[PDB]
Symmetry: D2
Subunit: 263 residues, 4 copies
């Protein structure tokens, strides 16, 4: 299936490693030019070169913090000057949380709000004009299964991911007149660096069986009884941003291997 | 049906007028002592006296802004010193919004976040300990039909009400061990001061038929083809905070007259 | 709270025992006259005696199978002859299932369809005309938490309860014009004779500790860590059919002690 | 993107015209062999000719009524004899309804139950064993946006499509162990012969402007302001049955151009 993505400009946040990078690799395969946005400068270099060397696409690096207005502003200016504008926006930047409502500081609630919601909000305000002028395009929000099905230990992640999911929906109705399709992807258990590292830290005192630990999490939560590869998830982002998905508007697509327990 | 609410302490935000006041009136009828929280000092006096004179309950007035930490802190201290703690918390404070994502300022997103989410968050941290020590109780979040079904003109209200709805759910799972039931009520079209006033303002230039305007909004959105009285809504808050609703935990109850178009 | 249903006529199916009987006692407490519908003739005679003596209301007993068109015809005619019509209809008749899709016979699919969906359909078009001529009324479908959150071992129960939940909302949209409010209740873990008998069967070869079994089902599934009494569920049916819930139209209300994992 | 389904065997019901045919062309494009299932014998012969010439794949035609147990038996036996088993099953057979609950006959309720729900049930337990012996596969149920967002005029369609959506998820949970992914697609406004013929009927006495009628249905219901081509819907069926969607299990995917009003 021809995705019709060749030559398009895709800006992806949280893309120095893990899910963000695999999504960027997915677009590169389809001939998309890629704007990588992340905090980690060195990992950004790693990623950009790897994309160039494997796929031969153009890659622009924007090493900023999207949780701040200044950082978002830098992104939009790098995009404007290099390519004119973007055709594809993927809001992937974010991190899990770990707390109780009773003991977490106000500053932390604020932080995730800035990261998960305000970043998508600011990047939309910033990039939509250029996108509007280029004839339209696609925006994707990577929320989480937690936006609908909260995990007990991360209330702030749950709350702010639900806010993101709703934002996606409201944005969708605002910009569709501009031929801009806005959708939302809710991944389940995705085998990331973060997951492996927390598997290392939690088993260091009981024998370091990290694959055994991961397997029991998957057995507990997912009927398919495995984590997904970031590459598997990536496939869905690419297809939803393609000219093969032209009727997808304001929807929430789950990629969770059965983990969602509700209709 | 005996609600078993007599002598209980109910703290209600946004209660100087409208929905907040009717909820407070609902609790007063059932013999609950009432902590009224609102910004408008004079209207607070009006309300408190009206409750005293009609129902004979104790009424404590807390004239603060719950969108700020200092304001919430004042509430919890007034409650602690007067009654020891609260048995019932109703998070009703809030307001609709009016904007496009493309043109709204960051400050406004922040404001509704502080009002709709952080207030419920701060009041929970503050009041849950006293509630925990009194043997348990009930918390209600008044979100909106918009938390699930967004209205096109108020994205910020939609987003922050969806965040509130999720917060309610995560709080519910955290505090149920303490015999505290946390639920969420999503009202549809409720005939408020705000609605009548916007009906006056929008028809002032075409003949001032404000009841005609309201009726067409109801005809458009609700299968029951009328607004609800605040008193109708109030009934549901009272029952959910009663000892007759002891199995309601982490749920979202819709009072919308058919307005919700989805299962 | 005054429910405002004294003198009303409440038809309740599956009301010889368990939840149905507890619901009927809830209405009888509030002064409503009762039409008890169930299969077992002697169990009915005895429930009817308890209600007449304990509450002092009129009780009609209809000994029929509501899963058949003939059974529902007899309910209609009996209500017509004794009361003229109904003010309240509670569709509670039903049963859990147990099978794999791969093994289950078509007969089994048909039975649960007749029992969960067709029974309510037939009772609706049968009792509605009488209900509208009496000025309107209320209808509640007792579906299940399984209508949204499927249990792995009972796919037929899940499918048919899901169909019922949607039927409830479609009926709501159609009959609100006749001043008839239709709502749906979705119970979680409710302590019924079937759960007790299930727990006894499942533990017969490992110690016979049926209470310990039920406790562990609650611990796994419900954050409240216990089953509901039928009594505390009945409260909700009563309130939703009362004059205090006049704005509830086509809603689904969860009474699940936190069991629903999604918002 | 390489779909990875060349040489696969795709069974598609309701595939003589409209969406079913467009789906089958989608699979044939990707090199899959096709089992066309439909009622009309000559329409099938002709669709089969187009697919063989235009794409160069093997096409089996099964002229049966899948709404009956005999019809589905013949599909099973014909796949068994020609291919041995299926790798892909798309349940598309179906039709919109038109009635009030109050007027509709029990026969009509039964028909749509047989057609929307029982057909998929019977095809599942019939084709699954062959599918698992081939190493696994994919199954998609074409329900509707009406399975979640009911249209007022077709309650039976709403109920049975809601039952199907839940069936899809229950099957998903049961057969993922056999490496079989089951997912559900919920289309919005799709430009089909039935919509065209509906628009012609509805406008015969007011000017015969059927295109203008369809445009106004889109304007009212869908923010994208247009109907989807069957082609753009097919894309989604293909991708979801491909080797690129290996983590999609028991999900419901909306292709509705913004029509779904809730998130």
């Amino acid at each position: 299936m021809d995705m019709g993505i060749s030559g398009k400009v895709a800006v992806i946040t949280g893309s120095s490693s893990g899910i963000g990078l695999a999504i960027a690799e997915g677009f590169a395969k389809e001939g998309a030019h890629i704007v990588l946005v992340a905090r980690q400068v060195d990992r950004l270099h790693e990623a950009a070169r790897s994309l160039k060397e494997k796929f031969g696409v153009r890659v622009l690096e924007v090493a900023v913090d999207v949780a701040t207005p200044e950082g978002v502003d830098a992104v939009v200016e790098s995009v404007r000057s290099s390519f004119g504008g973007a055709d594809i926006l993927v809001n992937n930047a974010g991190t899990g949380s770990n707390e109780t409502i009773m003991e977490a500081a106000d500053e932390k609630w604020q932080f995730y709000w800035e990261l998960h919601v305000m970043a998508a909000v600011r990047l939309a305000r910033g990039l939509v004009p250029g996108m509007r002028a280029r004839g339209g395009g696609a925006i994707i929000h990577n929320a989480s299964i937690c936006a609908v099905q909260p995990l007990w230990y991360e209330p702030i992640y749950n709350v702010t991911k639900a806010a993101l999911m709703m934002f996606s929906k409201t944005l969708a109705t605002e910009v569709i007149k501009d031929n801009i399709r806005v959708n939302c992807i809710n991944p389940g258990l995705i085998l990331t660096p973060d997951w492996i590292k927390t598997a290392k830290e939690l088993t260091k005192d009981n024998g370091g069986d990290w694959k055994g630990y991961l397997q029991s999490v998957a057995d507990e939560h997912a009927p398919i009884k495995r984590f997904a590869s970031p590459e598997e998830l990536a496939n869905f982002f690419v297809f939803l941003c393609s000219e093969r998905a032209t009727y997808s508007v304001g929807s929430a697509y789950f990629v969770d291997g059965g983990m969602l327990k509700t209709l």
